Design a protein around this ligand. Sequence first.
Ligand code: CMP
Ligand code: CMP
Ligand code: CMP
Ligand code: CL
Ligand code: ZN
Ligand code: ZN
Ligand code: ZN
Ligand code: ZN
Ligand code: ZN
Ligand code: ZN
Lengths: 239, 238, 230
Amino acid sequence: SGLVPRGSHMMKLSFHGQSTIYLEGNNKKVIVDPFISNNPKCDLNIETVQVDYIVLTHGHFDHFGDVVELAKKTGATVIGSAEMADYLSSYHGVENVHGMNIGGKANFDFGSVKFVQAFHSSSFTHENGIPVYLGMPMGIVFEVEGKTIYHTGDTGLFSDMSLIAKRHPVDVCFVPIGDNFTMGIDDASYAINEFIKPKISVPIHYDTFPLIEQDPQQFKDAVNVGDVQILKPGESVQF
Amino acid sequence: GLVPRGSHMMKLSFHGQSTIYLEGNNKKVIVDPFISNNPKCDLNIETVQVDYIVLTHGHFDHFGDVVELAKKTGATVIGSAEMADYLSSYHGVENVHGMNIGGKANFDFGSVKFVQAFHSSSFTHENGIPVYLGMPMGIVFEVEGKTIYHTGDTGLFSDMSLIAKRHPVDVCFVPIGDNFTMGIDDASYAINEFIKPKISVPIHYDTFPLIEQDPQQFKDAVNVGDVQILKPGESVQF
Amino acid sequence: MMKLSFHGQSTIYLEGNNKKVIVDPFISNNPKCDLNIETVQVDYIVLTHGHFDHFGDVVELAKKTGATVIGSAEMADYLSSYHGVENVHGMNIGGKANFDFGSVKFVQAFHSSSFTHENGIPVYLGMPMGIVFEVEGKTIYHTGDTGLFSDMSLIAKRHPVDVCFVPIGDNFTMGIDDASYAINEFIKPKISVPIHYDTFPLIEQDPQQFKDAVNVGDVQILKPGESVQF
Ligand SMILES: Nc1ncnc2c1ncn2[C@@H]1O[C@@H]2COP(=O)(O)O[C@H]2[C@H]1O
Ligand SMILES: Nc1ncnc2c1ncn2[C@@H]1O[C@@H]2COP(=O)(O)O[C@H]2[C@H]1O
Ligand SMILES: Nc1ncnc2c1ncn2[C@@H]1O[C@@H]2COP(=O)(O)O[C@H]2[C@H]1O
Ligand SMILES: [Cl-]
Ligand SMILES: [Zn+2]
Ligand SMILES: [Zn+2]
Ligand SMILES: [Zn+2]
Ligand SMILES: [Zn+2]
Ligand SMILES: [Zn+2]
Ligand SMILES: [Zn+2]
């Protein structure tokens, strides 16, 4: 316990399938949208994953994923909408939640989390077929170890992507390309070129299901600003 | 062995509230089928033929007869992921296709792209507890070379210009009823400043006393394209 | 002088043509609220959204005063059918209605809207909203609980604003930086009042940092019970 915490390195930021990202800030571990056990393309394993924090963009099954079991096993704090925190706390018995809402910023030991708007939906559907409403869907702006990371969440194209990116210039943007349920290739590449203009773009939310199969090279070819890193599950952003 | 019917003026009609009907590649599509409980609606649940039902949002005056119409016709119901789950799991609808805002899907009639809207989306059970059915939406269709923008139930928003610049619009269906949506002034502003379609059709008025409007005031206020004030049963003229 | 007062969190009160209006009546459960449920007089209750800290004492206040509750379709249906409130008027975003007090127009917001029943299952109550009032020749924009959005400029350009009530608490809404940007860049009202801070430890802020950051019009840091000075 007398050992000094591990010193600085290249910021750790990895993609794990669908909308799942993992990052470390000040030796704390953060995961977004942990769809691990039910995504066969996800390289993570809920028995071995180490996390201090879980952040949810919205409540759909392919983002909510293993949050309850993961939080209960790790003691991780779950960060989400006010509705998401009350649902996790009062319906699922998750002990450590932090409710926020759009535009809200919070400072944690790992860095900062700010929720931003998205155009999508947010619910988890129960056995009777009734969606449970879990707030407006959101994107995330992280400030971690000097890096600004914008995870758009599941979203359609919107011009305030430019307002988010102007007010919070972006090192890394994770942007969905799968179409049907989100932007496709054309809208995502327009989002990056016209509005966000990050240093690095990573396409997300494709191939997990047949309906959202896409060739991410068509995204790369359409992006004219910064660098595109087409990450396979398990791969880290190179800064 | 007969070849399917060949090409004609694109078939596109208005049926009261926000109900529109269109044909693409000999497939029949209805939006927001509020038929049996809208006495101003010219259609009849027992006779209307549809291959697809598209829902902009869950409110009773749009959801309407979707369950009984889908059951009779075998039509595919296209809507939000929440609307697809609810219809399929709670109501037993056989054929659903879930989507979400910004998603585009290709069907045998043409394409459906859902876009954003500012409103609400639920269906209220008897006990006063809404069933959440996603964010409200508009629709961009591409059918037989025509781009149709149905704005859904919505307030005015500047990204109407983004939608229209990215998908230049042949016909825009825009609500004018006020109280629950844009009224005359906001809808005409939407058309003049943001959407700039070839043809505008005002919708979502007169169905209930609270949303009675003179659509001529909308026509008078619009300075771009053509305005066609359609009565229930009337077709857009191209 | 038009009567317009702040009462803690996002609660405002105004009078138009002798009719009394309250927004987001979080009275009994806000120890900083100067009002008392048993003695507030109102003809109208307007709700930006369903959260406990806005919904507040709406059912009790409505049942006691006979006030008409103005909100989203979903809020009017829930209050009427679930809570048995006698007098509701359902509206939705972009809609305007004319009352004897003046007009109410709901506008967009970025937040959430529900009231949580037992077991952490929310009752959906629509999209969250702001309000544009026109009352005794004054345009009042209550942004509701919201994040920053550029259509704040569209709302303000189409409805030039005398008074803007804008949240600064952060975590659940805009903080100081985003609110002052909203006022300076988008809304540019005659008078800005910060709201939705200090009620709970998480949303404690110094409203003086908001006043210092605002370069347009006049900032009035109202304490609960104080009136806007025209
Ligand atoms: N609750 C759920 N749990 C697991 N898989 C689901 C659930 N809901 C939908 N899916 C699947 O997830 C897929 C995503 O979109 P598809 O249309 O490809 O088909 C969907 C279903 O097969
Ligand atoms: N769930 C519902 N089912 C049937 N009619 C409804 C429902 N909700 C509202 N209405 C009626 O539809 C009308 C819409 O406009 P009004 O608010 O004037 O009055 C409303 C009611 O008369
Ligand atoms: N439904 C509720 N009823 C009463 N208090 C609540 C409710 N929801 C949240 N709170 C409290 O309100 C506080 C708002 O700020 P905090 O997030 O710090 O902590 C929150 C809770 O302690
Ligand atoms: Cl915008
Ligand atoms: Zn989703
Ligand atoms: Zn998703
Ligand atoms: Zn509606
Ligand atoms: Zn409607
Ligand atoms: Zn709130
Ligand atoms: Zn609040």
